[PDB]
Amino acid sequence: MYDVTPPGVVMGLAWTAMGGSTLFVETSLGSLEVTGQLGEVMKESARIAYTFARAFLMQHAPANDYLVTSHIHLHVPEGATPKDGPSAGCTIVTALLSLAMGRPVRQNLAMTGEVSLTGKILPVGGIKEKTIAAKRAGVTCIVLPAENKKDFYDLAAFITEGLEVHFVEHYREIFDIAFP
Amino acid sequence: MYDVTPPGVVMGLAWTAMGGSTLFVETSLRRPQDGSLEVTGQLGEVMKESARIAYTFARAFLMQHAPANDYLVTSHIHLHVPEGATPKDGPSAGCTIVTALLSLAMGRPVRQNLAMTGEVSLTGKILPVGGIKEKTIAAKRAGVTCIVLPAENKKDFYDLAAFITEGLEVHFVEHYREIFDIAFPDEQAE
Amino acid sequence: DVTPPGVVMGLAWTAMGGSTLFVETSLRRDGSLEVTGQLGEVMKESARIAYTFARAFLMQHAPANDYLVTSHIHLHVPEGATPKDGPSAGCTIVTALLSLAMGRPVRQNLAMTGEVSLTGKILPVGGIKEKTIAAKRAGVTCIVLPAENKKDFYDLAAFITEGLEVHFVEHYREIFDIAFP
């Protein structure tokens, strides 16, 4: 649904009932409100992402108040299985911060991964489906949790060769890649 | 999740549908600089109340232990109690949550490979819990070297096969202060 | 002086002695509970603990009755208790909420004290002499105390103890069976 992402839009990768998709998580204009309507599971996954994103912005740019003050809107497209919903977690943080800083995310980036309150990156599933979806969407850098590593190299070489892959353990690491 | 836990983060031992699990309680700020607690983990009301019990006690305990530290009274904190324990077992996360708070507030991390279970009263009394075998199993599977239990679960722990119970350093406690002293040994005694 | 539904007599430890205090639940004006008779954060949470446990406990024993989950309620807990004795009115509150929900008065001639946990444990409290003496000054010949305060009770002069029917309790359900025979 985008070629060059505006501020607050991050390509995440989703595991659907038929296969893999590339879904744009969106944030626009303290509160967070969330549409695409998921069940409470998404909602909490979002409030932990929301609180990690707030603290991260306090620590990175003590200066910036946008997250702690604004009335933000989170949109997560419907299509992900229930179980896959929180793996948008690192995509949700990235959008908040991309809004917060009025700064678009790096072009050609996709990520998946659950985030914890302190910011640990948790493994997810649908590695294949998602990695296939980044390829078809023409992404060339992909970011994945560190215990999903095997899962990445278990895929065909056709899928993986060419791909700039990062395996992360903590959010901060994703933050650098998305934001030079 | 962690091998070394940062501040605000504590290993708690849970009784689940499937068996046991070592779970990480996490705490952090969400606004900078009167305070509040936001709680997540998909909690029913009882559990929400359980977290409030730990918050109130933690605030009371810090006022006395570090009478200069206003961090819990003025701050806006998030608490995540990760999912796992049955409804019945949810209260047992209380000292864990107490410890998590005090760890964030004091900026001191918990002693390594510590895990704990026990319900906390409004005066810091530690009540007996269930799932002790599942919980020690989880500690063992998770590499835990030191388990802190309620003194009233002594008999549940002794009546376990010795190879489960083998290799753990175990402290049985009656009050929270005992559980603070095992977690924060280079904090000041009392 | 017959307790109407939602009124329980509680024993309080006050800095100069012992007092008897009527805890009071009424309908006022997803339910809600507003508390008065104001006390610090601890006595407030003790109230919250009791309200949460009494809704669980009523759900468990009376599936059909939605009163505690529907009604907007005022808890009055009279002043006087010290801070240290703050969580001691726990079982008394719970008992008023339940009285009121079953529209069932608490038995006559009864006072209680004790902290309640969410799992329904009754915990020991201080001030057992002063409270026992309060019961006695108020006419009460049947009183409900935590199990771990047994010691405390029998360390009293036989003169105080003599004639008082006493129930030592571990779990709130024991208090229910006593208060609502």
XYZ file of C-alpha atoms in Angstrom:
551
model
C 0.000 0.000 0.000
C 3.125 2.308 -0.165
C 6.313 2.844 -2.347
C 7.950 5.532 -0.152
C 6.704 5.548 3.414
C 5.568 8.653 5.100
C 6.282 9.285 8.748
C 4.540 6.769 11.009
C 4.277 3.945 8.389
C 6.452 0.784 8.703
C 6.309 -2.308 6.574
C 5.851 -5.273 8.861
C 5.423 -8.787 7.664
C 2.437 -10.836 8.440
C 1.502 -14.486 8.568
C -1.968 -14.948 6.982
C -4.395 -17.883 6.538
C -3.448 -18.396 2.842
C 0.194 -17.187 3.047
C 2.587 -14.322 3.764
C 1.788 -10.640 3.377
C 3.436 -7.311 3.664
C 1.277 -5.107 5.926
C 1.812 -1.441 6.650
C 1.440 -0.508 10.268
C 0.308 3.156 10.458
C 0.395 5.844 13.197
C -1.276 9.313 12.974
C -2.682 12.182 15.136
C -1.270 11.631 25.954
C -3.131 8.594 24.340
C -2.969 5.705 21.851
C -6.138 4.544 19.985
C -6.190 1.416 17.858
C -8.077 0.563 14.684
C -8.179 -2.469 12.578
C -9.783 -3.479 15.933
C -7.987 -6.557 17.183
C -8.787 -8.466 20.337
C -7.290 -7.466 23.572
C -4.220 -9.411 22.587
C -3.174 -6.945 19.978
C -4.147 -4.085 22.217
C -1.783 -5.079 25.031
C 0.890 -5.964 22.621
C 0.445 -2.368 21.431
C 0.481 -0.795 24.904
C 3.685 -2.502 25.816
C 5.088 -1.378 22.440
C 3.630 2.084 23.268
C 5.347 2.207 26.673
C 8.627 0.871 25.457
C 8.507 3.470 22.638
C 7.811 6.267 25.192
C 10.752 5.333 27.451
C 12.986 4.790 24.484
C 12.227 8.366 23.284
C 12.845 9.791 26.779
C 16.243 8.029 26.770
C 17.213 8.707 23.073
C 15.953 12.248 22.807
C 15.097 13.585 26.193
C 14.056 16.490 24.247
C 11.067 15.040 22.465
C 7.641 15.017 24.059
C 5.462 13.903 21.116
C 4.782 10.258 22.353
C 4.209 11.242 26.077
C 1.816 14.114 24.992
C 0.019 13.504 21.685
C -3.259 11.669 21.005
C -1.999 9.133 18.516
C -3.945 6.649 16.329
C -2.587 3.190 15.621
C -3.790 1.273 12.651
C -2.774 -2.378 12.178
C -4.186 -3.884 8.995
C -6.384 -6.949 9.449
C -4.901 -10.158 7.874
C -2.436 -11.598 10.425
C -3.513 -14.773 12.304
C -4.412 -14.199 15.970
C -1.276 -15.942 17.116
C 0.858 -13.720 14.816
C -0.386 -10.442 16.070
C 2.301 -9.447 18.561
C 5.126 -10.000 16.078
C 4.054 -6.664 14.717
C 5.343 -5.499 18.113
C 8.767 -4.184 16.768
C 6.849 -2.586 13.792
C 4.494 -0.828 16.177
C 7.370 0.679 18.115
C 9.096 1.806 14.966
C 6.013 3.688 13.670
C 5.458 5.482 16.936
C 9.048 6.648 16.879
C 8.918 7.391 13.115
C 5.859 9.667 13.869
C 7.463 11.075 16.998
C 10.519 12.273 15.122
C 8.546 13.335 11.954
C 11.046 11.084 10.290
C 10.264 8.443 7.657
C 11.618 5.012 8.046
C 14.348 3.795 5.846
C 13.035 2.878 2.428
C 13.155 -0.863 1.591
C 12.912 -2.148 5.198
C 10.771 -4.872 6.647
C 10.699 -6.350 10.205
C 8.913 -8.819 12.377
C 9.302 -9.500 16.024
C 7.633 -9.352 19.436
C 8.876 -6.707 21.844
C 8.893 -6.860 25.736
C 8.505 -3.799 28.029
C 12.240 -3.564 28.549
C 12.786 -4.130 24.853
C 13.942 -7.688 24.429
C 13.087 -9.021 20.932
C 11.124 -12.215 21.059
C 10.976 -14.883 18.356
C 7.976 -15.292 16.073
C 6.711 -17.620 13.471
C 6.034 -17.512 9.724
C 9.610 -16.841 8.964
C 9.292 -18.361 5.524
C 5.979 -16.818 4.672
C 7.221 -13.448 5.738
C 10.593 -13.711 4.135
C 8.870 -14.732 0.871
C 6.572 -11.663 1.191
C 9.567 -9.242 1.698
C 11.135 -10.716 -1.481
C 7.976 -10.324 -3.630
C 7.583 -6.745 -2.274
C 11.204 -6.167 -3.281
C 12.606 -5.561 0.164
C 16.388 -6.106 0.406
C 16.987 -5.533 4.095
C 15.044 -7.632 6.622
C 15.187 -7.637 10.473
C 14.317 -10.799 12.498
C 14.717 -11.980 16.074
C 17.905 -13.884 16.973
C 16.267 -17.303 17.817
C 14.589 -17.180 14.457
C 18.034 -17.571 12.885
C 17.905 -21.265 12.096
C 14.491 -20.566 10.719
C 15.952 -18.111 8.286
C 18.796 -20.389 6.956
C 16.375 -23.369 6.711
C 14.769 -21.548 3.705
C 15.723 -22.087 0.079
C 18.861 -20.262 -1.150
C 16.676 -18.716 -3.943
C 14.797 -16.879 -1.153
C 17.702 -15.846 0.998
C 20.727 -15.093 -1.196
C 20.590 -11.427 -1.981
C 19.042 -10.525 1.371
C 20.607 -8.204 3.922
C 19.442 -9.868 7.132
C 19.814 -8.700 10.661
C 19.110 -10.842 13.699
C 18.462 -8.847 16.780
C 18.272 -9.501 20.466
C 17.109 -6.051 21.613
C 15.021 -3.227 19.965
C 17.733 -0.683 20.147
C 19.442 -2.650 17.307
C 16.446 -2.439 15.043
C 16.305 1.318 15.841
C 19.756 1.997 14.421
C 18.996 0.132 11.105
C 15.700 1.998 10.573
C 17.231 5.326 11.586
C 20.861 6.175 10.488
C 14.780 -14.085 28.069
C 17.591 -12.656 30.195
C 20.671 -14.269 31.635
C 21.371 -11.088 33.521
C 18.319 -9.022 34.404
C 18.386 -5.260 34.232
C 16.705 -3.285 36.948
C 12.861 -3.578 37.204
C 12.985 -7.124 35.889
C 12.485 -10.319 37.974
C 12.133 -14.131 37.418
C 8.950 -15.426 38.872
C 7.816 -19.008 38.956
C 4.435 -19.826 37.713
C 1.910 -22.661 37.865
C 0.373 -22.980 34.351
C -2.184 -25.116 32.542
C 0.601 -27.176 30.966
C 2.890 -27.414 34.034
C 5.356 -24.825 35.199
C 7.203 -21.887 33.628
C 9.711 -19.323 34.744
C 8.249 -15.980 33.807
C 9.860 -12.462 33.708
C 8.107 -9.626 35.530
C 9.024 -6.338 33.948
C 8.735 -2.723 35.153
C 9.639 0.668 33.416
C 8.748 4.398 33.175
C 6.216 5.630 30.689
C 6.204 9.383 31.456
C 9.254 11.216 32.689
C 9.797 12.726 36.172
C 1.716 11.991 42.028
C 2.709 8.655 40.588
C 0.838 5.880 38.949
C 0.995 2.251 37.789
C -0.192 0.895 34.499
C -0.429 -2.832 34.352
C -0.456 -5.243 31.490
C -0.693 -9.130 31.104
C -4.379 -9.573 30.344
C -5.396 -9.647 33.919
C -8.841 -10.369 35.330
C -9.880 -8.111 38.145
C -8.465 -10.233 40.893
C -5.067 -10.108 39.415
C -5.334 -6.398 38.764
C -6.020 -6.172 42.449
C -3.114 -8.382 43.248
C -0.806 -6.001 41.450
C -2.160 -3.073 43.379
C -1.465 -4.947 46.602
C 2.193 -5.331 45.607
C 2.369 -1.659 44.482
C 0.971 -0.378 47.799
C 3.309 -2.607 49.818
C 6.231 -1.790 47.696
C 5.554 1.886 48.209
C 5.260 1.335 51.974
C 8.422 -0.707 52.206
C 10.585 1.828 50.321
C 9.419 4.771 52.494
C 10.946 2.927 55.396
C 13.947 1.185 53.770
C 15.126 4.263 51.734
C 13.179 7.134 53.275
C 14.905 9.529 50.821
C 13.708 7.727 47.722
C 10.458 9.214 46.394
C 10.626 7.306 43.072
C 7.521 5.168 43.666
C 5.423 8.062 45.048
C 6.163 10.478 42.156
C 6.656 8.181 39.099
C 4.490 6.804 36.320
C 5.369 3.170 35.953
C 4.295 0.326 33.841
C 4.154 -3.178 35.133
C 3.961 -6.146 32.914
C 2.958 -9.478 34.382
C 3.455 -11.879 31.562
C 0.905 -14.437 30.857
C 1.027 -17.919 32.190
C -0.181 -18.803 35.562
C -3.657 -20.155 36.133
C -6.209 -17.926 37.713
C -5.540 -19.671 40.975
C -1.866 -19.154 40.955
C -1.838 -15.527 39.978
C -1.484 -14.068 43.457
C 1.758 -15.930 43.942
C 3.508 -13.474 41.751
C 3.319 -10.935 44.514
C 6.849 -10.871 45.891
C 8.137 -11.003 42.440
C 6.154 -7.825 41.597
C 7.272 -6.194 44.925
C 10.842 -7.013 43.997
C 10.500 -5.744 40.395
C 9.163 -2.405 41.757
C 11.853 -1.907 44.359
C 14.447 -2.887 41.789
C 13.179 -0.156 39.334
C 12.828 2.399 42.149
C 16.242 1.780 43.683
C 17.997 1.251 40.310
C 19.594 -2.023 41.706
C 19.265 -5.304 39.753
C 18.180 -8.504 41.381
C 20.694 -11.133 42.279
C 21.380 -13.479 39.370
C 19.503 -16.743 38.802
C 17.114 -15.955 41.612
C 13.537 -17.005 41.306
C 10.728 -16.727 43.682
C 7.063 -17.376 44.327
C 4.735 -16.242 47.140
C 1.622 -14.145 47.831
C 2.205 -10.983 49.801
C -0.024 -9.449 52.421
C -0.507 -5.768 53.062
C 2.068 -6.072 55.789
C 4.592 -8.061 53.805
C 3.565 -11.452 55.242
C 4.334 -14.234 52.686
C 1.486 -16.748 52.147
C 1.744 -20.245 50.818
C 1.163 -21.017 47.187
C 0.493 -24.146 44.958
C 2.371 -25.669 42.065
C 5.626 -26.100 44.031
C 6.834 -29.165 42.082
C 5.968 -27.620 38.706
C 7.624 -24.435 39.840
C 10.863 -26.050 40.959
C 10.907 -28.063 37.698
C 10.626 -24.720 35.835
C 13.375 -23.132 37.870
C 15.525 -26.216 37.162
C 14.799 -26.179 33.447
C 15.478 -22.436 33.357
C 18.942 -22.717 35.010
C 17.896 -21.215 38.315
C 20.321 -21.651 41.146
C 18.422 -20.129 44.089
C 14.760 -20.455 44.821
C 12.925 -18.414 47.461
C 9.676 -19.942 48.719
C 7.141 -19.343 51.392
C 8.163 -21.142 54.688
C 4.738 -22.805 54.769
C 5.580 -24.615 51.482
C 8.568 -26.299 53.191
C 6.678 -29.613 53.221
C 5.732 -29.444 49.566
C 9.360 -28.907 48.730
C 10.826 -31.627 50.971
C 8.355 -34.266 49.659
C 9.834 -33.962 46.140
C 12.190 -36.393 44.461
C 15.645 -35.389 45.487
C 16.963 -35.010 41.934
C 14.360 -32.336 41.208
C 15.278 -30.607 44.408
C 18.952 -31.440 44.000
C 21.322 -28.547 43.032
C 19.153 -25.594 44.178
C 19.980 -23.230 46.969
C 16.605 -22.706 48.756
C 15.452 -20.075 51.139
C 12.137 -20.289 52.847
C 10.667 -16.990 53.987
C 7.957 -15.655 56.287
C 8.193 -11.952 55.404
C 9.041 -9.775 52.532
C 12.132 -8.289 54.147
C 13.658 -11.779 54.045
C 13.031 -11.868 50.300
C 14.550 -8.346 49.846
C 17.698 -9.410 51.639
C 18.163 -12.416 49.289
C 17.579 -10.267 46.210
C 19.495 -7.106 47.056
C 22.295 -8.295 49.277
C 24.401 -5.159 49.008
C 21.454 -3.080 50.185
C 21.311 -2.073 53.750
C 20.184 -4.563 56.366
C 17.085 -4.307 58.651
C -29.798 -2.337 68.164
C -30.326 -5.043 65.496
C -27.823 -4.990 62.552
C -29.753 -4.475 59.258
C -28.269 -6.003 56.145
C -24.863 -4.642 55.219
C -23.752 -3.616 58.734
C -21.092 -5.569 60.593
C -19.435 -4.745 63.831
C -15.635 -4.570 63.592
C -13.078 -4.359 66.263
C -10.520 -1.668 65.993
C -7.188 -1.044 67.705
C -7.031 2.737 68.390
C -3.836 4.494 69.611
C -5.307 4.975 73.147
C -7.084 1.586 73.279
C -9.709 -0.622 71.681
C -12.853 0.335 69.815
C -15.980 -1.242 68.314
C -16.954 0.216 64.934
C -19.889 -0.466 62.686
C -18.783 -1.058 59.079
C -21.565 0.004 56.725
C -22.469 -0.900 53.167
C -25.357 0.851 51.310
C -26.637 1.332 47.811
C -25.696 4.811 46.658
C -27.548 7.276 44.343
C -20.230 -2.513 35.882
C -20.789 -1.459 39.483
C -18.487 0.714 41.601
C -17.416 1.135 45.180
C -16.887 4.460 46.838
C -15.349 4.338 50.301
C -15.451 6.882 53.116
C -14.129 7.071 56.663
C -10.856 7.991 55.152
C -7.553 6.333 55.808
C -4.197 6.039 54.221
C -3.295 4.082 51.107
C -3.173 0.808 53.069
C -6.612 0.887 54.594
C -7.876 1.967 51.160
C -6.315 -1.069 49.401
C -7.681 -3.240 52.194
C -11.080 -1.979 51.129
C -10.320 -2.728 47.437
C -9.081 -6.200 48.425
C -12.284 -6.902 50.177
C -14.498 -5.680 47.394
C -12.606 -7.742 44.805
C -12.671 -10.915 46.981
C -16.348 -10.504 47.801
C -17.332 -10.252 44.190
C -15.257 -13.421 43.407
C -16.607 -15.224 46.445
C -20.219 -14.349 45.636
C -19.718 -15.379 42.041
C -18.450 -18.689 43.290
C -21.110 -19.468 45.845
C -24.079 -17.660 44.264
C -23.720 -17.761 40.480
C -27.068 -16.069 39.946
C -26.663 -13.041 42.049
C -25.148 -10.100 40.189
C -25.523 -7.400 42.896
C -21.915 -6.946 43.735
C -21.135 -6.717 40.045
C -24.016 -4.344 39.220
C -24.584 -1.978 42.156
C -22.907 1.325 42.877
C -21.922 0.992 46.597
C -20.816 3.244 49.498
C -18.560 1.605 52.111
C -18.314 3.522 55.337
C -15.493 2.434 57.663
C -15.474 4.712 60.731
C -12.247 6.471 61.787
C -10.009 5.692 64.751
C -7.915 2.706 63.801
C -4.185 3.451 63.749
C -2.144 2.974 60.562
C -0.491 -0.217 61.851
C -3.972 -1.771 62.267
C -5.034 -0.648 58.834
C -5.606 -3.917 56.961
C -7.349 -5.544 59.973
C -10.917 -4.546 58.872
C -10.643 -6.683 55.788
C -13.021 -9.523 56.766
C -15.538 -7.172 58.320
C -15.805 -5.223 54.982
C -16.175 -8.352 53.019
C -18.844 -9.529 55.367
C -20.837 -6.206 54.967
C -20.684 -6.423 51.167
C -22.065 -9.951 51.273
C -24.759 -9.183 53.882
C -25.930 -6.405 51.623
C -25.733 -8.559 48.450
C -27.792 -11.380 49.924
C -30.041 -8.769 51.678
C -29.255 -10.850 54.727
C -28.362 -9.395 58.039
C -25.305 -10.594 59.953
C -26.121 -12.541 63.027
C -26.648 -10.708 66.288
C -24.022 -10.586 68.928
C -20.934 -10.884 66.803
C -17.794 -8.997 66.164
C -14.773 -9.805 63.912
C -11.245 -8.708 62.942
C -8.666 -9.929 60.481
C -6.894 -9.182 57.230
C -8.123 -11.030 54.156
C -5.994 -11.914 51.180
C -7.260 -12.458 47.618
C -7.082 -16.212 48.039
C -9.356 -15.836 51.087
C -6.755 -16.394 53.804
C -7.414 -14.681 57.058
C -4.220 -13.124 58.369
C -3.319 -12.222 61.953
C -3.654 -8.708 63.300
C -2.341 -6.824 66.242
C -4.180 -5.321 69.201
C -5.924 -8.515 70.330
C -6.286 -7.495 74.018
C -7.678 -4.072 73.200
C -10.030 -5.591 70.669
C -11.121 -8.400 72.936
C -11.867 -5.849 75.707
C -13.837 -3.727 73.094
C -16.015 -6.637 72.227
C -16.652 -7.107 75.892
C -17.444 -3.492 76.642
C -19.964 -3.634 73.770
C -21.800 -6.778 74.943
C -20.430 -9.236 72.470
C -20.061 -12.817 73.546
C -19.167 -14.250 70.184
C -15.999 -12.995 68.329
C -14.148 -14.087 65.167
C -10.344 -13.994 65.113
C -7.536 -15.136 62.797
C -6.103 -18.554 63.553
C -2.541 -17.173 64.092
C -3.785 -14.897 66.790
C -4.751 -17.995 68.911
C -1.543 -17.554 70.907
C -2.341 -13.904 71.464
C -5.774 -14.648 72.742
C -4.839 -17.313 75.203
C -2.027 -15.207 76.617
C -4.865 -12.973 77.992
C -6.092 -13.221 81.573
C -8.628 -15.845 82.009
C -10.966 -13.125 83.334
C -11.083 -11.451 79.872
C -11.266 -14.706 77.984
C -13.782 -16.473 80.249
C -17.331 -16.702 78.704
C -16.501 -15.307 75.231
C -17.400 -17.668 72.485
C -14.386 -17.401 70.117
C -13.911 -18.692 66.534
C -10.436 -19.089 65.111
C -10.380 -18.907 61.328
C -8.044 -19.591 58.465
C -10.221 -18.951 55.461
C -13.042 -16.448 54.832
C -15.518 -19.240 54.115
C -15.308 -20.112 57.772
C -16.344 -16.579 58.646
C -19.315 -16.848 56.132
C -20.617 -20.041 57.707
C -20.500 -18.375 61.139
C -22.030 -15.023 60.197
C -24.736 -16.516 57.988
C -25.708 -19.860 59.609
